[PDB]
Amino acid sequence: ITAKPAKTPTSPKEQAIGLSVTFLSFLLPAGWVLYHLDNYK
Amino acid sequence: SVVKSEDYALPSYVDRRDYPLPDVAHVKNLSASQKALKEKEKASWSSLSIDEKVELYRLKFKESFAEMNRSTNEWKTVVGAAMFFIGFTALLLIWEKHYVYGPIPHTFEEEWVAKQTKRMLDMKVAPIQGFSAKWDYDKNEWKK
Amino acid sequence: ETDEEFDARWVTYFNKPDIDAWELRKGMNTLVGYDLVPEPKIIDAALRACRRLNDFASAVRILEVVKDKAGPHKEIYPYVIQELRPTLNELGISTPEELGLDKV
Amino acid sequence: SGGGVPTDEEQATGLEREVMLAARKGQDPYNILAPKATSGTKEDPNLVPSITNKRIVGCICEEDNSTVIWFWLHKGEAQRCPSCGTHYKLVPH
Amino acid sequence: MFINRWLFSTNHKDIGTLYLLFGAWAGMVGTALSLLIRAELGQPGTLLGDDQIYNVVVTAHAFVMIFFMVMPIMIGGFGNWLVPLMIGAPDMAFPRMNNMSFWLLPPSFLLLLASSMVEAGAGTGWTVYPPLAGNLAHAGASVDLTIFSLHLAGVSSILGAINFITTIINMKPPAMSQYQTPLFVWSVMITAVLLLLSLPVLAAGITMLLTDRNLNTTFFDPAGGGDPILYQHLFWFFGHPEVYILILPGFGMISHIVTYYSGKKEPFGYMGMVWAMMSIGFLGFIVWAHHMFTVGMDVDTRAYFTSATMIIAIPTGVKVFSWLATLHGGNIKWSPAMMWALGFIFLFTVGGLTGIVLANSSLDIVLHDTYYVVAHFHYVLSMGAVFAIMGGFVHWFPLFSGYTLNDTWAKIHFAIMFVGVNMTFFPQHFLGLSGMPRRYSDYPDAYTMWNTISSMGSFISLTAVMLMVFIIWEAFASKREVLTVDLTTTNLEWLNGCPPPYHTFEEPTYVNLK
Amino acid sequence: ASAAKGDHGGTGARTWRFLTFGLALPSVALCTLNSWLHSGHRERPAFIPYHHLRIRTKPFSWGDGNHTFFHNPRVNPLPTGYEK
Amino acid sequence: STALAKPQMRGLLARRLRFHIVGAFMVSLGFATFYKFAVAEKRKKAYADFYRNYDSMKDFEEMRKAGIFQSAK
Amino acid sequence: APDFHDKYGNAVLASGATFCVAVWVYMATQIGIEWNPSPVGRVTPKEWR
Amino acid sequence: HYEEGPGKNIPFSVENKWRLLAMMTLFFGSGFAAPFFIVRHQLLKK
Amino acid sequence: MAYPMQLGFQDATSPIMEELLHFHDHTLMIVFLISSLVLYIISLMLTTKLTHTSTMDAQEVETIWTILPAIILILIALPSLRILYMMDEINNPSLTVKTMGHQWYWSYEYTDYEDLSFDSYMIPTSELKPGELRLLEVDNRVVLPMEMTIRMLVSSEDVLHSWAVPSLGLKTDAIPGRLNQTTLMSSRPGLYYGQCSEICGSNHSFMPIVLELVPLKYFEKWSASML
Numbered sequence A: 001i002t003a004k005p006a007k008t009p010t011s012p013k014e015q016a017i018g019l020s021v022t023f024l025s026f027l028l029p030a031g032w033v034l035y036h037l038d039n040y041k
Numbered sequence B: 001s002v003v004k005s006e007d008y009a010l011p012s013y014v015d016r017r018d019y020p021l022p023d024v025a026h027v028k029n030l031s032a033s034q035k036a037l038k039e040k041e042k043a044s045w046s047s048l049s050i051d052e053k054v055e056l057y058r059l060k061f062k063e064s065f066a067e068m069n070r071s072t073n074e075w076k077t078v079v080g081a082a083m084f085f086i087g088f089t090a091l092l093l094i095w096e097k098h099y100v101y102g103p104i105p106h107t108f109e110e111e112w113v114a115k116q117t118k119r120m121l122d123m124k125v126a127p128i129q130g131f132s133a134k135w136d137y138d139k140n141e142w143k144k
Numbered sequence C: 001e002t003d004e005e006f007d008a009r010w011v012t013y014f015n016k017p018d019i020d021a022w023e024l025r026k027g028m029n030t031l032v033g034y035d036l037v038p039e040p041k042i043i044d045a046a047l048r049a050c051r052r053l054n055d056f057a058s059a060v061r062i063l064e065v066v067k068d069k070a071g072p073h074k075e076i077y078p079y080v081i082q083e084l085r086p087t088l089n090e091l092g093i094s095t096p097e098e099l100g101l102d103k104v
Numbered sequence D: 001s002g003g004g005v006p007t008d009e010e011q012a013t014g015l016e017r018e019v020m021l022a023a024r025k026g027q028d029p030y031n032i033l034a035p036k037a038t039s040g041t042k043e044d045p046n047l048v049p050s051i052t053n054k055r056i057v058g059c060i061c062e063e064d065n066s067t068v069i070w071f072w073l074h075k076g077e078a079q080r081c082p083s084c085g086t087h088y089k090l091v092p093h
Numbered sequence E: 001m002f003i004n005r006w007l008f009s010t011n012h013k014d015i016g017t018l019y020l021l022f023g024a025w026a027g028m029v030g031t032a033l034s035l036l037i038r039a040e041l042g043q044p045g046t047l048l049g050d051d052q053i054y055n056v057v058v059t060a061h062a063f064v065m066i067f068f069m070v071m072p073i074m075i076g077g078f079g080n081w082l083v084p085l086m087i088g089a090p091d092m093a094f095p096r097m098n099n100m101s102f103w104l105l106p107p108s109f110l111l112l113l114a115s116s117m118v119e120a121g122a123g124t125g126w127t128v129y130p131p132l133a134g135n136l137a138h139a140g141a142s143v144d145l146t147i148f149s150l151h152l153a154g155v156s157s158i159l160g161a162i163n164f165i166t167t168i169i170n171m172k173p174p175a176m177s178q179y180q181t182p183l184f185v186w187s188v189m190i191t192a193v194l195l196l197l198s199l200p201v202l203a204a205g206i207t208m209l210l211t212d213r214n215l216n217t218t219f220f221d222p223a224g225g226g227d228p229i230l231y232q233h234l235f236w237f238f239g240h241p242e243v244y245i246l247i248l249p250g251f252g253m254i255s256h257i258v259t260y261y262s263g264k265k266e267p268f269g270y271m272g273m274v275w276a277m278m279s280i281g282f283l284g285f286i287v288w289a290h291h292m293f294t295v296g297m298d299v300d301t302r303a304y305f306t307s308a309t310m311i312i313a314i315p316t317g318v319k320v321f322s323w324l325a326t327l328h329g330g331n332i333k334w335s336p337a338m339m340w341a342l343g344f345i346f347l348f349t350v351g352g353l354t355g356i357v358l359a360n361s362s363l364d365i366v367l368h369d370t371y372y373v374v375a376h377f378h379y380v381l382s383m384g385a386v387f388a389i390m391g392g393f394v395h396w397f398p399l400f401s402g403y404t405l406n407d408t409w410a411k412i413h414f415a416i417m418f419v420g421v422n423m424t425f426f427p428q429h430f431l432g433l434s435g436m437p438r439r440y441s442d443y444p445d446a447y448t449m450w451n452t453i454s455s456m457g458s459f460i461s462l463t464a465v466m467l468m469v470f471i472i473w474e475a476f477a478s479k480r481e482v483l484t485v486d487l488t489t490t491n492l493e494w495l496n497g498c499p500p501p502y503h504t505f506e507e508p509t510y511v512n513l514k
Numbered sequence F: 001a002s003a004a005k006g007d008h009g010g011t012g013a014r015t016w017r018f019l020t021f022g023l024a025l026p027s028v029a030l031c032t033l034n035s036w037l038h039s040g041h042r043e044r045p046a047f048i049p050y051h052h053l054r055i056r057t058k059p060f061s062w063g064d065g066n067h068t069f070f071h072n073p074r075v076n077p078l079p080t081g082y083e084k
Numbered sequence G: 001s002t003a004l005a006k007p008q009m010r011g012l013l014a015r016r017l018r019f020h021i022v023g024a025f026m027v028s029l030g031f032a033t034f035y036k037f038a039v040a041e042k043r044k045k046a047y048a049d050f051y052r053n054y055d056s057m058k059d060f061e062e063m064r065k066a067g068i069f070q071s072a073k
Numbered sequence H: 001a002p003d004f005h006d007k008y009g010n011a012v013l014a015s016g017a018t019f020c021v022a023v024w025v026y027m028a029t030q031i032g033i034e035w036n037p038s039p040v041g042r043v044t045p046k047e048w049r
Numbered sequence I: 001h002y003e004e005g006p007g008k009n010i011p012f013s014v015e016n017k018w019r020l021l022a023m024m025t026l027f028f029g030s031g032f033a034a035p036f037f038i039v040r041h042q043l044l045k046k
Numbered sequence J: 001m002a003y004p005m006q007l008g009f010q011d012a013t014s015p016i017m018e019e020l021l022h023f024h025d026h027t028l029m030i031v032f033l034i035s036s037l038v039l040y041i042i043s044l045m046l047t048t049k050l051t052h053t054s055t056m057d058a059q060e061v062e063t064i065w066t067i068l069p070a071i072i073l074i075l076i077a078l079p080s081l082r083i084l085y086m087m088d089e090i091n092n093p094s095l096t097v098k099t100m101g102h103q104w105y106w107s108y109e110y111t112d113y114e115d116l117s118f119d120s121y122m123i124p125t126s127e128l129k130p131g132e133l134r135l136l137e138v139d140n141r142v143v144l145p146m147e148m149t150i151r152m153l154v155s156s157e158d159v160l161h162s163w164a165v166p167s168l169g170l171k172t173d174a175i176p177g178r179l180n181q182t183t184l185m186s187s188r189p190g191l192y193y194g195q196c197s198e199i200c201g202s203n204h205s206f207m208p209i210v211l212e213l214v215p216l217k218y219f220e221k222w223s224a225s226m227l
């Protein structure tokens, strides 16, 4: 396929931010629940 | 040169080794000297210079076969990054082991395992191939 | 159909004196789908069609597609160029190598 | 028997009525029938009606091919199927 | 305008987009459930300390992944976006009913959430067998909310099947016969026929379960002359067609992807591919009892169901060999979608072969209700479906959105997922052969090594799913707009541009008869 | 109904040929296998001169009057038992 | 100084397929003789060797003397 | 002109591989995971009764 | 009519990539977090 | 029982399980033939720059690749069905034993002569005696005579369970209102373990089966002592 260059380029720094935020969004809430499992039990 | 979104229903240019002669020329508009070059192409091609021949090629096509078929270093980025993220996964597993999992059962203590192993040998667990078959009952040791 | 019968239909196709640009492209883009590198006699007819159509660039591209169709059989393209040298000289077709177009 | 039931001639409306009246005149403005091919040479191209300046053609190049070849046909000089070369010409508007 | 467009839609592309968003969200739920399963099993002992909760997690994992991730993505998402485009139709036959098929799914999923929040959940298995699922062993509302969730998902899919069959039979160009429609369209038609016939039988069975639980019927209760095994026959009479419903659209997409990235105008052996999907569809109704070889079944019935189950590998093999024959001679483009399709072929072949092992009822006695079955279906079905979905999502994302993915990131994502799923599920063969039961929250100590590896694998695929979300974000964040797409002459869905306009084929294609 | 096909569109000759070679003749091939596996001679049962079997109210109009038309000596006893 | 000889130009893909499908076949044969020998045959011998002079009462008495049984001291 | 892979591919490959091996070896050996391997050739059986 | 074209045929905005990251975070993160909170809920009833 | 890092089946305790091992090896020899063939062929398709993209005629090769799989399936089916009908053959049991599943334990009835019955529960981990197996031992084992054909009858008094002993190749669902029959014959004395194999609720993982196989005379005195 061919395509235009990005209209709004996402630099390496911006990708590191988006990746870090994405991973934290999955990891922090589950991590909080699992860390506190024995509290629930 | 410039391909526009609104041109999606028109014949288009592509560099593919299995479609050597695309439906349009790479460059459709010609300057004065490019027009003169296309007129000169109507005469013997032995009279074109090397640079003129290259220019005619680059008006018709964007990349040569050698350019469109070039290998790249992308594999290094792909394999390296995949290993980074697999490595990151082990950080998650270390976190889980430290903060989520408690002790495993007492049956994994070394002395328990040693007694359990003797009892499995005394009941001849898997005596044909699997387990007790690997113990030498006469020498009282693992078969070498 | 025999090999020679195949080659001869293709030679006849490209030798049509008033072959047009669309027919030149249709012929080459169809030919390269088959499991073979076209015989020099077919390539000769195609290159002369390019001449009748005043299209130097397509002649060079046709030589590139010959080298590509041979895959890892590096002996095929030099043989075909050898067999085509009289036509190349006659028509003033430079090879991709002579034009630098084999460099990446 | 008796009467009292309207007919389509009396009461069909909208697009249904358009299709019905066109069929009576043997016309097919809403594309219900498959067009029959001409010989498809440059002298006798298949004529492709359109309400705009381009329409997608699908070419079943040989009878019973399962692969259909699709391309935009534009107003202007006849174009050829990229697989079989049969000619088509847009007849707009 | 927003409500009219997105809550009152009558447009096949927007509805398809709603289904893809719904299915991607459900896939997060189903992945989190699968990580709780593997966390409980990742070391010996108890993690949750509540095996009723473990059983609820397993049950909801399967319902989410089957009814809210795979079916909505394959049939609601790819089917709605692609089928009308691939036949040049202006929309689906029933564009308004199509929107109700979508909107029944958030309430169905809400009922499944409700089942898990009230009482102690439905810890039944996705099979929901009585008497465990009856009103003495699962007293209270949880199982009834699960039944109602299934009823709504069934109505959604039965109406959707009606819509797809009608659209595919009635709305092709007049010159286009059924043997000129693309294989993906075939695969959706056949899936829809299986849905139409099988989901009403499930609906009957789960309604009998509902009345045994609430109206004092005894269909499945021996005290009234009922029989628990009758429920299993009605469930599996649906459930075998269901596994083929889950994979058939995937076979369709794989045929298109392998043809496209081989640089071919057509798949090898088109009529053989149609024959094979039709044969799988038909034989898919006569094998169900292979899910019941340990219930106390007579030997001649076991022999019949073993033999009929083996006959299905034949048409499935034509399809695997025909995908290999499509690659043959191709100008192979090593795009990320091609990697997903080649992964699919490998993983589906592994899983189908262990299904052949299971078909032998004598071996199935020892393998039934063990992790060998879990390994068979996570290869052939779960990961076959996920790899076809990811291949199709990567391949058609630029059509649906108008933007391109970063292909290097997409290849990294594929590599991580391929390692993760194989580390997760391959060791489960050994667990099954050595006798570990499925549906267990803990295991005898001998089984520790392979459960530990399998659970570590599950975290690798978690990293891959997180990276997939980032990759989708990066594409919408960077806005690289598509220009040219190759092979549009044999891939009609691309010919209207990227994304296509809201209305397409307002003037139909011209196709003559000759 | 409890089928699993699809096509419809038109049922023409091409479709019925497809059914003939893709479903009907394979089914005949499979039942020909099933049958040419359960072929073989089982052990014939003890003769018992049951009065409701081997009925003879009038001699048959062929042979010796006492053999049925497709009499098979291996499996069809006479009123007096199997033949030697 | 010398012309190049004419090489084979037609059917190169089909020729490659034909050659290697054969190699693929002869590898599956070379494997099955191995897997039968290293696994299947090994197992037949292990069971037959084990049972050839097996004495179930002697096995029982060993187990009983080791203390394993509820029903036999 | 050299792209991202020409500029950084060698470093990404080398650092990713080194990091992956190091962290998995650490996780497998240094944090108390019980892999429960076979006792054959490993465990000296001890009287139990 | 409705807006057509890239970025316009979707029920969420992609006009600002950081607002989009927040929306995608909440969307996929809520689905992934839900089972962990349901488990927590069930454990806290005992 | 299984042992750490086991890859395949438990060693056979009965002749039927030995038959199954040999048949599984056969099926696996074929599985490995087909898998490696596919892998080799796909790799071949993916490793050349030579191309052939024009239409390919299919009918010849589709004969090969339907007929070969059909032959293979017959080569699996024939031994499969022989074992199935062999497992079905009458064997004339010397003893009938019933087992009833319950949430979450098994009971056993030996009522050919006297009214002998008892319950069998998992030993909790905290109470295992040293060297006993976590999640597998029971308080009251199913003592049975070795080298004898035994009819087991399996049912349940509540939900479904399933009575399994992998090393004897046994798994029979336990269904209330139904009395399922299976036969068992151990070639050897010893202790043979299984686990409940149909999900039956919260303690499905924790209701195991332990057979203790001993000479007839010891089984007889054990039976009398259990009255």
Ligand SMILES: CCCCCCCCCCCCCCCCCC(=O)OCC(COC(=O)CCCCCCCCCCCCCCCCC)OC(=O)CCCCCCCCCCCCCCCCC
Binding pocket: E006, E017, E018, E020, E021, E022, E024, E025, E029, E105, E106, E107, E109, E110, E112, E113, E114, E397, E400, E401, E472, I009, I010, I011, I012, I013, I023, I024, I026, I027, I030, I034
């Ligand atoms: C066509 C090209 C794309 C093709 C690719 C496909 C895309 C897929 C990959 C590309 C993926 C990109 C993802 C983009 C994120 C979409 C975010 C969104 O806000 O989606 C759009 C929203 C509207 O939001 C917006 O318009 C934001 C922009 C402007 C609005 C202004 C206010 C912002 C409000 C806050 C947003 C909250 C976000 C959610 C927060 C969620 C919190 C809960 O509406 C809708 O139509 C909803 C669509 C269907 C949702 C189905 C899931 C429902 C699951 C729940 C079932 C119930 C029981 C579960 C319970 C069961 C448990 C057992």
Ligand code: HEA
Binding pocket: E126, E243, E244, E246, E247, E290, E291, E292, E309, E310, E312, E313, E316, E317, E318, E320, E348, E349, E351, E352, E353, E355, E356, E358, E359, E360, E364, E367, E368, E369, E373, E376, E377, E380, E381, E382, E384, E385, J034, J038, J068, J069, J070, J072, J073
């Ligand atoms: C995508 C979903 C999917 C698909 C396609 C399949 C396909 C098959 N399945 Fe599977 N199956 C499941 C999902 C699926 N299954 C699920 C979810 C369960 C368990 C449900 C539960 O209990 O929760 C299950 C359970 C299941 C069982 C019951 C086991 C048990 O409960 O004890 C059996 C038994 O026969 C079985 C067999 C098969 C067979 C023979 C196929 C065949 O269709 C496979 C055919 C494919 C091939 C064979 C490979 C390709 C072929 C070649 C390369 C050709 C040559 C091959 C030969 C000559 C053999 N499956």
Ligand code: HEA
Binding pocket: E020, E023, E024, E027, E028, E031, E034, E035, E037, E038, E058, E059, E061, E062, E063, E065, E066, E069, E070, E073, E124, E125, E126, E127, E374, E378, E381, E382, E383, E385, E386, E389, E390, E393, E421, E424, E437, E438, E439, E440, E441, E458, E461, E462, E465
């Ligand atoms: C499609 C079906 C499907 C899928 C995808 C999965 C995915 C996974 N399953 Fe699944 N599983 C079942 C269906 C499925 N499962 C069923 C039917 C059962 C039986 C239930 C019962 O016994 O009653 C079961 C049971 C089961 C068990 C056995 C539980 C037990 O016996 O106690 C285990 C154990 O490890 C397991 C693990 C996993 C893991 C780790 C994953 C995954 O984490 C693997 C990696 C996959 C992903 C990460 C998928 C991501 C995809 C998306 C996020 C969609 C994205 C969408 C777009 C881009 C549009 N599953």
Ligand SMILES: CCCCC/C=C\C/C=C/C/C=C/C/C=C\CCCC(=O)O[C@H](COC(=O)CCCCCCCCCCCCCCCCC)COP(=O)(O)OCCN
Binding pocket: F068, F069, F070, F071, F072, F076
């Ligand atoms: C290959 C499949 C079969 C194809 C047909 C083969 C011949 C059958 C002919 C059919 C005629 C049908 C009439 C039925 C009469 C009985 C024949 C029944 C079929 C048959 O052929 O039966 C045979 C007996 O034939 C016998 O008596 C001798 C029968 C010959 C004499 C028949 C005389 C009676 C005919 C009277 C017809 C009256 C019709 C009136 C129609 C009026 C309608 C308005 C059976 O053989 P068997 O050795 O006893 O057992 C087999 C043991 N190994």
Ligand SMILES: CCCCC/C=C/C/C=C/CCCCCCCC(=O)O[C@H](COC(=O)CCCCCCCCCCCCCCC)COP(=O)(O)OCC[N+](C)(C)C
Binding pocket: C001, C002, C003, C006, C034, C035, C036, E321, E324, E325, E328, G010, G011, G014, G017, G018, G021, J034, J037, J041, J055, J056, J057, J058, J061, J064, J065, J068, J069, J072
């Ligand atoms: C469990 C295991 C079960 C069993 C699996 C068994 C697999 C069996 C596989 C068979 C392998 C052998 C098939 C060999 C086919 C090779 C095709 C060929 O031999 O040749 C190609 C034939 O094309 C034509 O007609 C039509 C095109 C070719 C027609 C055949 C297409 C090739 C099919 C290859 C399939 C490969 C993948 C197999 C996957 C298993 C043609 O090339 P040419 O340029 O010379 O033509 C030019 C001809 N002129 C010049 C004379 C006109």
Ligand SMILES: CCCCCC/C=C\CCCCCCCCCC(=O)O[C@H](COC(=O)CCCCCCCCCCCCCCC)COP(=O)(O)OC[C@@H](O)CO
Binding pocket: E093, E094, E095, E096, E097, E098, E148, E151, E152, E155, E158, E162, E199, E200, E203
């Ligand atoms: C435990 C209790 C669970 C209860 C769950 C209840 C769930 C659903 C609530 C249902 C609300 C129904 C509202 C009316 C729906 C009418 C659908 C309809 O009539 O749809 C029609 C198409 O389906 C057709 O014909 C043929 C199809 C008509 C179907 C009508 C609706 C049936 C709904 C239930 C059936 C389930 C199947 C039961 C057997 C398993 C029309 O299609 P449209 O796209 O609209 O328009 C197209 C225009 O061209 C018309 O001018």
Ligand SMILES: CCCCCCCCCCO[C@@H]1O[C@H](CO)[C@@H](O[C@H]2O[C@H](CO)[C@@H](O)[C@H](O)[C@H]2O)[C@H](O)[C@H]1O
Binding pocket: A027, A028, A029, A030, A031, A032, A034, A035, B092, B095, B096, B099, E035, E036, E039
């Ligand atoms: C299967 C899916 C899950 C996969 C793995 C998740 C990986 C973990 C991500 C980190 O999660 C965080 O971990 C912290 C600990 O590292 C927790 O802080 C907890 O512990 C801290 C340190 O003891 C205290 O500072 C905090 O207040 C206390 O909440 C915190 O709550 C939780 O969000």
Ligand SMILES: C[C@H](CCC(=O)O)[C@H]1CC[C@H]2[C@@H]3[C@H](O)C[C@@H]4C[C@H](O)CC[C@]4(C)[C@H]3C[C@H](O)[C@]12C
Binding pocket: E271, E272, E275, E318, F014, F017, F018, F021, F022, F026, J059, J062, J063, J064, J066
């Ligand atoms: C006749 C039908 C359609 C042919 C057409 O009109 O194009 C074709 C398509 C697929 C074919 C079948 C498949 O190729 C699979 C089988 C191949 C065997 O060689 C013959 C039986 C076999 C079952 C084929 C019979 C028949 O030739 C089929 C059914």
Ligand SMILES: [C-]#N
Binding pocket: E240, E243, E355
């Ligand atoms: C599979 N069934």
Ligand code: CUA
Binding pocket: J101, J102, J103, J104, J105, J160, J161, J162, J196, J197, J198, J199, J200, J201, J203, J204, J205, J207
């Ligand atoms: Cu009892 Cu599981």
Ligand SMILES: [Cu+2]
Binding pocket: E239, E240, E243, E287, E288, E290, E291
């Ligand atoms: Cu099934």
Ligand SMILES: [Mg+2]
Binding pocket: E294, E368, E369, J162, J197, J198, J199
């Ligand atoms: Mg079961």
Ligand code: NA
Binding pocket: E040, E041, E042, E043, E044, E045, E046, E047, E441, E442, E443
């Ligand atoms: Na656990």
Ligand SMILES: [Zn+2]
Binding pocket: D059, D060, D061, D062, D069, D081, D082, D083, D084, D085, D086
């Ligand atoms: Zn055509």
